[PDB]
Amino acid sequence: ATYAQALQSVPETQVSQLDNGLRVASEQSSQPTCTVGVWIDAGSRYESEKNNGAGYFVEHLAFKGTKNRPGNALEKEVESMGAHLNAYSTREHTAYYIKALSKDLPKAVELLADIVQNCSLEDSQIEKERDVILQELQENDTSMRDVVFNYLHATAFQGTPLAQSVEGPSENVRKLSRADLTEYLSRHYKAPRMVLAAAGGLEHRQLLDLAQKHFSGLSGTYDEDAVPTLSPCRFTGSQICHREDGLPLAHVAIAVEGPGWAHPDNVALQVANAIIGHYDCTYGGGAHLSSPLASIAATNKLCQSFQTFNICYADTGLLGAHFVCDHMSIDDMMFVLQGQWMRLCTSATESEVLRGKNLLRNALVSHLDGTTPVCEDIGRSLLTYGRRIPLAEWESRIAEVDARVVREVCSKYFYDQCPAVAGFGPIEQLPDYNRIRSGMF
């Protein structure tokens, strides 16, 4: 079997929809375990200054007990069957999922339904989580990477909902009320905004059945004056520098505006980013790495690490890189990084683009390894593309990318464009914005 025949042998993702609007999607395998969950079009991009952090607060309460299973009863039930319950929130999506034995799918779906519809939100629990969240804010402050990425969003999307952090400002954490949360929930947690996804040893018909049984009551109306729609978010070439010479290493994140989830250009952009790549001091390749940036950094000890990224949102995104280095290496790192973007815009070669394509192929497949990664792909894809894009399609999209396509697409997003820059730490050497801007051409 060639790699081509392999892509054509992957079970298609079955999609159905309930009367209330809830989408039900699954990919069947023969695994004796599975992952099933609810993905929701809810996140801080949907929050206003006044309730920013509401979604994250809810995540903290989601597993603390439901009307039907008060307190730790939900917990005991998940644990006793050896299942795992997890959740995550981002600026646009929220997910609650369970990993369990395939034979326990019915109870898994019931629990998710119970969590998503009957969360207690007991006043005393809300007060406890308030303190937990404040402490998590303090811990996050010690993560320079998380700080710099929140800063990048704050400046790149300043004045818009995307500028907001997922956790929200501390004053919001101290003041959010049960009212604020229930309000947030009623407006966003509607069936038309949710996707029940599952991957593993189960059949779509069984999942659909269970969905009809446990999620039918979920509202699918809302109305007309309470249907949270997204406004485009202006991007702003700008810079935010938080100088703190007390920190040992500087963190810098730089990005130009990306196209957004739905755009075909994301594939070529992923190929370009794969060419530049990622790196850190523990990589065994060193001076021989294919990425010029990676080998230059390794031989000249320019940084502790660096990573390119393509963060996508509905109609915009952040395309760029993040690096961690010594206070005397920032200018050199920026110089080499920008030089690599310019080289791709004007002189990408067929051979390096082929490497980029192969890197992307391996990443796409190795990522969909296990029921959880697959289930997440189903849930998120249905929310973003409105369909599961098959591997065979991804291959076709990757296949059409060549050096010409890379130069043109890179030129479109990087060439002579204003970037958003965020720096944190001993950044006296972080280049002036004008110098960074001139580096874009």
Partner: protein, 423 residues
């Protein structure tokens, strides 16, 4: 939609003792690993850290491929090459799209059967030992688990996965050659593959892995001793582990300990949950309001360590450790309900199945069985062996822990951290 197959695992043992095992899952990508009995337990007092450097030397020049070619060649096809080690095994794994297995296999074979360990390349790599160790040791758990093994054993399993500081810059080319020649032998190797056809993998092993060396140089049996290593470093939080010798992996008694581990609590099941069914956690929680506790279980070929691990504020170290210990003492006294044991079995069974869900876990499972028992025990059988564990077996495992000579390791501000004899 109905899935492709699901085919069965193909097994083949060659005359020289090398085992080959593959599963064609018809995936677009392949994963191949060469498992070897060459973990740190095989180093002796004169060559400590040699296996750590070996682990970091996978891209050095070989007879059939230069260091430069290995890196560029694997990257050209977006492939991957990594080396993973435990105290007993070393696993060299390659990942790539299925049409490029021929390329990754050639590099894999050069790296493991024809390394040159050129004097200047080996010298230039030494500094990496310092960087790699510093990164790993940023994790207090690493400090504690390495010290725990050093405290528990007189030898072999006592060796660290990381090179001792005094040896950095001293590991010689001859020691590397010696190590590969004494341990990378046919009867100590297993070539495992996922997403590749058994015939090709079989022909690759037959033509290029038809080495010799037999069982190679096995080590001395691990001799449990017991003891304690305390590392004062003034951290706000104290990390500590208390164990006793349990049982060798592969024995029925090992299963009892695995079930006991899940009765006590072996990790979280719910994001930010209170771990309502974790016996050790609930026992500490009753007598303490910021900490973490977990049953610890390590099973090796000729021994095993079982106990618990705690993380707490420095002043509460004694309270947490004693509360956790007392909770295990009640199990040893027979205070164990059938519902608790069934729940533990469910967690264990679901846990095992979830761990072989991904290619990485699958490969690690098959590769380890291949080296440990030179045979394959399917999930079905494993689950049965788990159901077969009796409540009395679990109670007896707890009693073995309680009366057994202890080994302990702790790091942090230890002003209130008790000694073994105070427990």
């Amino acid at each position: 939609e109905v899935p492709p197959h699901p085919q069965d695992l193909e097994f083949t043992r060659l005359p020289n003792g090398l085992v080959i095992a593959s599963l064609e899952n018809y995936a677009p990508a392949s994963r191949i690993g060469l498992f070897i009995k060459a973990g740190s337990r095989y180093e002796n007092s004169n060559n400590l850290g040699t296996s750590h450097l070996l682990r970091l030397a996978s891209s050095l020049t070989t007879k059939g491929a230069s260091s430069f070619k290995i890196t560029r060649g694997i990257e050209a096809v977006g492939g991957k090459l990594s080396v993973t080690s435990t105290r007993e095994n070393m696993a060299y794994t390659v990942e790539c799209l299925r049409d490029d297995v021929d390329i990754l296999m050639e590099f894999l074979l050069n790296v493991t059967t024809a390394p040159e360990f050129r004097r200047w390349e080996v010298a230039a790599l030494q500094p990496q030992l310092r960087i790699d160790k510093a990164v790993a040791l940023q994790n207090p758990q690493a400090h504690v688990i390495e010290n725990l093994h050093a405290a528990a054993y007189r030898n072999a399993l006592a060796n660290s996965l990381y090179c001792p500081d005094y040896r950095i810059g001293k590991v010689t080319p001859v020691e590397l050659h010696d190590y590969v020649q004494n341990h990378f032998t046919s009867a100590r190797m297993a070539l495992i593959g996922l997403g590749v056809s058994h015939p090709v993998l079989k022909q690759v092993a037959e033509q290029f892995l038809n080495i010799r060396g037999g069982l190679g140089l096995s080590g001395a049996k691990a001799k449990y001793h017991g003891g304690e290593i305390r590392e004062q470093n003034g951290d706000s939080l104290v990390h500590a582990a208390l164990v006793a010798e349990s049982a060798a992996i592969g024995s029925a008694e090992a299963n009892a300990f695995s079930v006991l581990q899940h009765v006590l609590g072996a990790g979280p099941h719910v994001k930010r949950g209170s771990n309502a069914t974790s016996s050790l956690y609930q026992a500490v929680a009753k007598g303490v309001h910021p900490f973490d506790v977990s049953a610890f279980n390590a099973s090796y070929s000729d021994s095993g360590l079982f106990g618990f691990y705690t993380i707490s504020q420095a002043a509460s170290a004694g309270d947490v450790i004693k509360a956790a210990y007392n909770q295990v003492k009640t199990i040893a006294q027979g205070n164990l309900s059938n519902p608790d044991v069934q729940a533990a079995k469910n967690k264990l069974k679901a846990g095992y199945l979830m761990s072989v869900e991904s290619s990485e876990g699958f490969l690690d499972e098959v590769g380890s069985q291949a080296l440990a028992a030179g045979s394959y025990t399917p999930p079905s059988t494993v689950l049965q062996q788990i159901d077969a564990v009796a409540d009395a077996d679990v109670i007896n495992a707890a009693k073995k822990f309680v009366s057994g000579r202890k080994s302990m390791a702790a790091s942090g501000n230890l002003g209130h951290t008790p000694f073994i004899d105070e427990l």
